[PDB]
Amino acid sequence: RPLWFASKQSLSYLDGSLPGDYGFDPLGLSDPEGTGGFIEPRWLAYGEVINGRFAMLGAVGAIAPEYLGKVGLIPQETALAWFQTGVIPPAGTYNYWADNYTLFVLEMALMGFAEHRRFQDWAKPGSMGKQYFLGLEKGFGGSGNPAYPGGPFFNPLGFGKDEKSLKELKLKEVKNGRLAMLAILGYFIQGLVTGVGPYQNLLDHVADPVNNNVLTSLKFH
Amino acid sequence: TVAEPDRPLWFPGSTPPPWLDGSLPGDFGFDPLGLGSDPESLRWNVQAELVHSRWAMLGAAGIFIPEFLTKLGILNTPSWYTAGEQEYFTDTTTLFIVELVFIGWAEGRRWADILNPGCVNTDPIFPNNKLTGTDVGYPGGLWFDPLGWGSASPQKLKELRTKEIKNGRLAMLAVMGAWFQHIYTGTGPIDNLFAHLADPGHATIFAA
Amino acid sequence: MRDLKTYLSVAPVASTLWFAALAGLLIEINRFFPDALTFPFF
Amino acid sequence: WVTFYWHWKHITLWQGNVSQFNESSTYLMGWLRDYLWLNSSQLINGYNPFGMNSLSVWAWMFLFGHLVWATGF
Amino acid sequence: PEVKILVDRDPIKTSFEQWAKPGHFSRTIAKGPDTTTWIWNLHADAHDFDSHTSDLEEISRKVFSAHFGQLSIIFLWLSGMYFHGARFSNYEAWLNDPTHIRPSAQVVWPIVGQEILNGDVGGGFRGIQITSGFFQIWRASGITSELQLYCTAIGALVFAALMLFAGWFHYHKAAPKLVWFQDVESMLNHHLAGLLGLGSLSWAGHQVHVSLPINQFLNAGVDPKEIPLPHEFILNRDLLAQLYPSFAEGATPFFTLNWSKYADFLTFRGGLDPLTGGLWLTDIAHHHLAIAILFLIAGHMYRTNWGIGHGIKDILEAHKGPFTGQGHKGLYEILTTSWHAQLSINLAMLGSLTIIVAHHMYAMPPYPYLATDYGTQLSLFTHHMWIGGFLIVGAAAHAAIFMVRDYDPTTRYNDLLDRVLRHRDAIISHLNWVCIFLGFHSFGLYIHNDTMSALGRPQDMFSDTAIQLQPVFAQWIQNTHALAPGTTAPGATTSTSLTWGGGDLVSVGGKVALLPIPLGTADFLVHHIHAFTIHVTVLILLKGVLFARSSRLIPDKANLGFRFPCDGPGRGGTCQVSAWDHVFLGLFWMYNAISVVIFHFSWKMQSDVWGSINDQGVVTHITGGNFAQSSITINGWLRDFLWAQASQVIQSYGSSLSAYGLFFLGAHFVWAFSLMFLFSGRGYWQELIESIVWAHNKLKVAPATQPRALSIVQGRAVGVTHYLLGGIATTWAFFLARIIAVG
Amino acid sequence: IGSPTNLIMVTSTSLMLFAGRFGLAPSANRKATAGLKLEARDSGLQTGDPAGFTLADTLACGVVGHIIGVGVVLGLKNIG
Numbered sequence A: 001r002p003l004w005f006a007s008k009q010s011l012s013y014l015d016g017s018l019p020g021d022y023g024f025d026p027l028g029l030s031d032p033e034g035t036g037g038f039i040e041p042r043w044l045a046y047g048e049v050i051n052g053r054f055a056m057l058g059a060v061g062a063i064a065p066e067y068l069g070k071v072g073l074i075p076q077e078t079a080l081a082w083f084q085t086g087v088i089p090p091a092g093t094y095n096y097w098a099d100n101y102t103l104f105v106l107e108m109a110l111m112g113f114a115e116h117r118r119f120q121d122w123a124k125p126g127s128m129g130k131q132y133f134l135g136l137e138k139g140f141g142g143s144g145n146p147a148y149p150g151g152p153f154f155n156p157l158g159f160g161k162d163e164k165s166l167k168e169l170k171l172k173e174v175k176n177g178r179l180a181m182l183a184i185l186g187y188f189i190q191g192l193v194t195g196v197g198p199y200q201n202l203l204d205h206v207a208d209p210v211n212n213n214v215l216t217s218l219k220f221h
Numbered sequence B: 001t002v003a004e005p006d007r008p009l010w011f012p013g014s015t016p017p018p019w020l021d022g023s024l025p026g027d028f029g030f031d032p033l034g035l036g037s038d039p040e041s042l043r044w045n046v047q048a049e050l051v052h053s054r055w056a057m058l059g060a061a062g063i064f065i066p067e068f069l070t071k072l073g074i075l076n077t078p079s080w081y082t083a084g085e086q087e088y089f090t091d092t093t094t095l096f097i098v099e100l101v102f103i104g105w106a107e108g109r110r111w112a113d114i115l116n117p118g119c120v121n122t123d124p125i126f127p128n129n130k131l132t133g134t135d136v137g138y139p140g141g142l143w144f145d146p147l148g149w150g151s152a153s154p155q156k157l158k159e160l161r162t163k164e165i166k167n168g169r170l171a172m173l174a175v176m177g178a179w180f181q182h183i184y185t186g187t188g189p190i191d192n193l194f195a196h197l198a199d200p201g202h203a204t205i206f207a208a
Numbered sequence C: 001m002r003d004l005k006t007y008l009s010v011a012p013v014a015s016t017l018w019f020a021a022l023a024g025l026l027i028e029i030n031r032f033f034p035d036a037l038t039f040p041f042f
Numbered sequence D: 001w002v003t004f005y006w007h008w009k010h011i012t013l014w015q016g017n018v019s020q021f022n023e024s025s026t027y028l029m030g031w032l033r034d035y036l037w038l039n040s041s042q043l044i045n046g047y048n049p050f051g052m053n054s055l056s057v058w059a060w061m062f063l064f065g066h067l068v069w070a071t072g073f
Numbered sequence E: 001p002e003v004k005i006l007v008d009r010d011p012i013k014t015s016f017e018q019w020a021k022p023g024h025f026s027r028t029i030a031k032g033p034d035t036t037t038w039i040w041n042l043h044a045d046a047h048d049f050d051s052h053t054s055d056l057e058e059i060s061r062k063v064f065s066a067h068f069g070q071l072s073i074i075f076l077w078l079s080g081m082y083f084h085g086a087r088f089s090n091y092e093a094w095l096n097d098p099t100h101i102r103p104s105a106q107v108v109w110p111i112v113g114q115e116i117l118n119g120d121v122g123g124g125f126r127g128i129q130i131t132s133g134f135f136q137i138w139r140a141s142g143i144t145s146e147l148q149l150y151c152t153a154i155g156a157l158v159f160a161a162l163m164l165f166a167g168w169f170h171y172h173k174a175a176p177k178l179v180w181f182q183d184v185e186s187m188l189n190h191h192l193a194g195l196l197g198l199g200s201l202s203w204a205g206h207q208v209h210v211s212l213p214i215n216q217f218l219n220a221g222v223d224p225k226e227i228p229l230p231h232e233f234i235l236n237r238d239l240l241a242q243l244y245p246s247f248a249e250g251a252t253p254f255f256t257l258n259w260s261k262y263a264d265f266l267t268f269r270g271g272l273d274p275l276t277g278g279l280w281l282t283d284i285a286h287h288h289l290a291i292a293i294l295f296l297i298a299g300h301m302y303r304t305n306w307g308i309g310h311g312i313k314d315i316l317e318a319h320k321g322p323f324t325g326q327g328h329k330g331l332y333e334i335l336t337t338s339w340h341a342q343l344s345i346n347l348a349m350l351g352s353l354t355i356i357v358a359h360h361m362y363a364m365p366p367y368p369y370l371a372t373d374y375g376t377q378l379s380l381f382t383h384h385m386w387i388g389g390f391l392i393v394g395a396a397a398h399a400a401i402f403m404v405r406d407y408d409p410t411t412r413y414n415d416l417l418d419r420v421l422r423h424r425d426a427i428i429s430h431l432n433w434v435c436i437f438l439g440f441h442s443f444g445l446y447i448h449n450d451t452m453s454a455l456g457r458p459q460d461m462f463s464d465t466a467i468q469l470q471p472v473f474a475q476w477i478q479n480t481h482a483l484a485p486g487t488t489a490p491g492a493t494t495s496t497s498l499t500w501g502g503g504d505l506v507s508v509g510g511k512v513a514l515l516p517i518p519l520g521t522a523d524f525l526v527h528h529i530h531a532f533t534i535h536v537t538v539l540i541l542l543k544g545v546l547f548a549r550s551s552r553l554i555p556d557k558a559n560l561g562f563r564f565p566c567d568g569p570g571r572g573g574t575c576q577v578s579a580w581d582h583v584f585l586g587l588f589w590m591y592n593a594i595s596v597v598i599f600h601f602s603w604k605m606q607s608d609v610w611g612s613i614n615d616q617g618v619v620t621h622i623t624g625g626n627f628a629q630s631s632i633t634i635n636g637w638l639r640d641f642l643w644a645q646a647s648q649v650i651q652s653y654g655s656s657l658s659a660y661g662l663f664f665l666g667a668h669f670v671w672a673f674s675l676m677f678l679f680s681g682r683g684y685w686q687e688l689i690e691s692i693v694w695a696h697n698k699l700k701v702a703p704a705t706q707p708r709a710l711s712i713v714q715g716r717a718v719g720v721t722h723y724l725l726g727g728i729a730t731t732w733a734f735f736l737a738r739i740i741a742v743g
Numbered sequence F: 001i002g003s004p005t006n007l008i009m010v011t012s013t014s015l016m017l018f019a020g021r022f023g024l025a026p027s028a029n030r031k032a033t034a035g036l037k038l039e040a041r042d043s044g045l046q047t048g049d050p051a052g053f054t055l056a057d058t059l060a061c062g063v064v065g066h067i068i069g070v071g072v073v074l075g076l077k078n079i080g
């Protein structure tokens, strides 16, 4: 069992039953002694799961259109960096079929339905397949585990039908999530420092590792 | 009068309040602030919601139908917002005082029924007429229920009353919708509908 | 709810609401009839 | 109150300026300004950084009375 | 032993049931009132948490949520301030002509003729001139448009909501644990480095990016609307380089240690900027950077969970000598158990800090065009002085409270405190003698000067022209300060303040900002008066604290409580023996001290500094340098200060300053109103209420809540409250009228 | 590289890392008393290093190495 910067506090509760358990908690945040709001070790594992998943989509989709437009068929009108997409209007705003703000209201309504019902599987797991909802209720029952609900919608292919391969895939999801979470954090700081794009910065360092923006530390938009 | 435990709630997954058991029409367990916790406030606000719903449904039609046909080559009705500034066959204050006297009579007898059910169901001049309804907020009688769809079995009456409160809730939002629309926009609400249908992605609230 | 209404009936809150309504009324009276050292309607 | 009344009415009468009393005795800022403050001029200047006159014995007793009174507090 | 987050879930249910039950917190008060005294007790014991329960955890959670509520109210207050600056103010007009426009942020409604208070403040604005100084702050920060003040008010409203919600949360939901509150090392670490360090660093980051460039453009005369927005200095660094060239590098000298390049916008020139009259903004930003580094370092002294660091218990226990026994051992257990002890310490230190702020802000004006807004400066000084004095009196009160309630040698002993108690008699007798000596050798000199000036003997006075008592020490100190730049301070370009360095008179817009302050016999006498008054206040308060438990007169005073009227007419009379009454008298004496302090400040500034400067350099002060000859006399203070400068407030009727003329007399009224309570006792008043109750019961209109005269303690509390309110509001009206008229 | 600041910084750093790595300075497992005694504490925070150097004491030594480094560099640059 690999232990990375463990402590007598961390090893007391970090048991190894949680997926990706490397025994790392110098701050003792998953400490089960004084549990209240959001400082619940189950909620913290769910937070890493969801943050890692969304960051996997983020780490891909932020550097995806820039590389795609560099060498690809999708037109160069839509090929920009993630910060020049209209996310940050002062960094560059592209005009879609809506005014950005209406895109936000529409996405808040959609994410509202999805995330509210995802939370109802955390507060009362199983209750999301009881009230009428134009069908769809069966797959919204869950497997009891909030971070791993499964079902016909979210796990139709049945990967890891046994507990062994399920554990291995869970271990893989945890480390992929941590990798992509550090990735989008790197995108944030690189777009803050380099200001040219997540992939344009990588190309500046590939053909020129002597560049080294660390010693540079100058920032422009 | 018929409680329903597994009724579809406003917030699926949550627990309904102990004082909202589903016997009322349009019951979705929605009272997060507990405004109608005690039975006294519950029945008063039930009458308040019902009268609100009925007035707003009359108002929703009084806006959305004349404003619609006048946009077409049919009618000449002015704006509902500026309909007060108009001059009719007499000054507005006289119309309002007449309205106060006559509507005050109707609300006075309605108040007597709410505070004391059944004590007002007779005509004080011709006693043989009377009102047949037995529920508060549903007076019945020949005047207010001539077609007779209001004296029927339970469940059926509950279905119709659920329809009534739902349409009224939609109408209350509709009337307030037209209000804040004509304040935000400078045109009639039918122009807001057409402006949005012309460009749903841009002609929104984020247009100014 | 009943406890909330019982709180609104306590002496300071009833005093504020009563004196606020009283202050607003006297302000509007002196707004439509300012000054006035006498009872002019005789 | 009795003596503030008597002295102000007479000290304005003796000065031939009864209008100042008739117009300023109807509000208390007039009593503070046009009676105590105004008539204290020659008194408090009984002795100044530039010398003194025969009114200094009152400027001293004036402060003397302020001390005894405050000592009683 | 391992510092960690610890809370409980849902300890107290959220319900209005206890709202409807007055006095629910107390067991005797919850039964409802039998007499009217109940109504007062409900408010007197409303915040006495440690008397509602004995569980330290409940008390700590209540205190935490009370702090959150206070922060919510302060954020709401700031929201109101910024919103009034945005909506009902002439800040944009004051921004173009700061030397002629009067700052105003309140406009009254026209109802009963009060619109006269909307006076001509300049910039086409009718309002009330403000002395809080928010205009100077908003200019120093770089705010230009009303929109930015709007956004700041909205943010402050959101933060007030956040603080209120957090207060509800950490009491009704996730409510912290006792050990969590008691993790003192972690808390001090986060307050030194996290709160103060990172706060100073954030403000230094704002000042180097917004304050410095926008203020350069404001000093240059650029129109504020034609000034680039602050964020435009964060995108195109060409704009920042055109004003401060070092920004063209890009954090490279910081990492390579070529910090000498940053001397363009991080300077140590000192003094005042002659265009604005405030401290050089580059110096203030450099200051905040240094403060940030120092606090970020200091927030690492105390151990937490990683072995390295200190434990305060060891540091305390290790400090014991041959005079104090095993001193400091036990203090860590005291200060981690008693809230009142911490409150006493922090009130004392925060009040003294407020006084230090009052001095440092007048002698070193931090904001542009603050030094010439005489009203704002006088008001800031006086306000901070009063805050500090009150807070120190509260420190005394809570020290006495700890003595009565949390002190117990059988459980949490400390040798230093026991040794202090074992010679309280010597301490108090010596302080008494010092107070008598200072009273004779300061005020007695004033009486000597009065009696010599009245007898036609101006050479037998104590004066700069006769028997001189020069403050040689303070003069030599300010001279050493003047010569420090270039010698014992080579990096300093000018003096620390202008009151030190000879010459170097800074004036702004025809009015003086600062100049070297003279120090003579008058200053000596007044400083000794200040020392004497401070000593008598300290005597009262400390004597109340040390004798809170026992005395030769009452050996069981601690059983009577902290707040009790007396112990009977016996022993000759035992009135006002409680420590509460000692705080009650220390209030009067703190007033008597602070009033003389602020009057000294006012007369000194209006006589030897503030005034009008000529084109050729001729400075005529508001009063003709009359401080040296007139202030060495009580009659001079009566005539050349009060009688002369009260003219503006007694003449303000019919102008926009008439509200000050009304408050002058109203405060006189409430001050004299207090004397009815302070000079009388409740027995007479109860005997009067008896006949009044007869009159009521005759007409079937007597209340069930039997009327009762105020308690003895309540009599004194009302008396001192009204006395303080009247005196302070009188001085407030007088100061504001005088300085706004002649300013 | 590119300045004497590198030599002074790597000296103060590596020397302070050196004094904390082995004995000779207060570590996570070496607690100090009267300014000279180093009693042996159990830190609790695990580190792979067998002699006693921890990551908390690593960051501590690196920071103090930079404190002394910046102090010496700006002291020798402002004199000679």
Ligand code: CLA
Pocket: E669, E670, E671, E672, E673, E674, E675, E676, E677, E679, E680, E688
């Ligand atoms: C300026 C100081 C002052 C004032 C205002 C008073 C006022 C009063 N004294 Mg008093 N007194 C004083 C000094 C003062 N005294 C001193 C120094 C002593 C020596 C110890 C005494 C000893 C004394 C005795 C022995 C007695 C009184 C009595 C009275 C009352 C007489 C009844 C009356 O005249 O109707 C009212 C007069 C007023 C001035 C009331 C003014 C206040 C009004 C009501 C303000 C209105 C409130 C308004 C809304 C403000 C809002 C406040 C907000 C914070 C809520 C009266 C309230 C006698 C008494 O009790 O009467 C039955 C009584 O026997 N006095």
Ligand code: CLA
Pocket: E063, E064, E067, E068, E071, E180, E181, E183, E186, E187, E190, E191, E193, E194, E195
């Ligand atoms: C870097 C960490 C940090 C920071 C910034 C603060 C900041 C503050 N603490 Mg705190 N504290 C900390 C750590 C920290 N604390 C730790 C580790 C402990 C021991 C476990 C304590 C225990 C403690 C107690 C017992 C009390 C405080 C109080 C306060 C407030 C003092 C009043 C003030 O200065 O007004 C200045 C106002 C501001 C600077 C505005 C900024 C406020 C921000 C938004 C708060 C963010 C810091 C917070 C700790 C982050 C967690 C919140 C997050 C989960 C949402 C202040 C805002 C007092 C209080 O409760 O006040 C309400 C008080 O009673 N603290």
Ligand code: CLA
Pocket: E043, E044, E045, E046, E047, E048, E049, E347, E390, E391, E392, E393, E394, E395, E397, E401, E563, E580, E583, E584, E587, E721
């Ligand atoms: C952070 C500062 C702080 C804190 C937290 C406390 C906290 C506490 N103090 Mg304390 N105190 C402080 C500062 C502080 N004090 C200062 C600065 C002083 C010097 C004046 C005092 C002097 C003091 C005394 C003498 C006593 C306390 C007491 C208490 C305890 C009960 C408080 C209570 O319920 O009274 C209730 C509050 C009121 C009844 C409000 C009274 C109204 C005020 C006094 C006048 C309002 C005037 C207003 C400012 C402007 C006029 C507006 C008006 C016209 C509407 C409590 C734990 C009491 C105690 O029992 O100790 C355990 C006690 O007797 N304090």
Ligand code: CLA
Pocket: D067, D070, D071, D072, D073, E431, E432, E433, E435, E436, E437, E438, E439, E440, E443, E444, E447, E536, E539, E540, E585, E588, E589
């Ligand atoms: C103007 C009124 C007044 C005066 C003069 C005093 C004077 C004094 N107070 Mg006091 N006080 C007052 C109001 C006053 N108080 C009020 C209203 C309160 C209620 C809050 C208090 C509450 C209070 C407390 C709680 C205490 C004092 C204390 C003191 C003494 C401090 C020691 C000192 O200064 O020695 C010097 C003496 C003087 C300054 C008085 C003037 C002396 C003159 C200049 C000398 C003249 C001598 C001359 C030769 C006389 C001979 C003439 C012969 C023919 C008869 C002092 C005598 C403290 C104390 O006891 O002392 C340690 C103390 O504990 N006071």
Ligand SMILES: CC1=C(/C=C/C(C)=C\C=CC(/C)=C/C=C/C=C(C)/C=C\C=C(C)\C=C\C2=C(C)CCCC2(C)C)C(C)(C)CCC1
Pocket: E293, F013, F017, F058, F059, F060, F061, F062, F063, F066, F067, F070
């Ligand atoms: C494991 C390993 C090893 C070892 C290594 C080492 C030895 C390391 C180290 C070390 C290091 C790498 C160090 C460094 C550091 C740094 C740090 C730790 C930092 C920081 C920060 C801060 C906190 C700062 C601050 C400041 C100052 C000081 C002053 C003021 C300002 C400023 C901010 C600048 C070997 C090879 C054997 C083997 C393999 C691997």
Ligand SMILES: [Ca+2]
Pocket: A028, A029, A030, A031, A032, A033, A034, A035, A039, E004, E005, E006
């Ligand atoms: Ca925990």
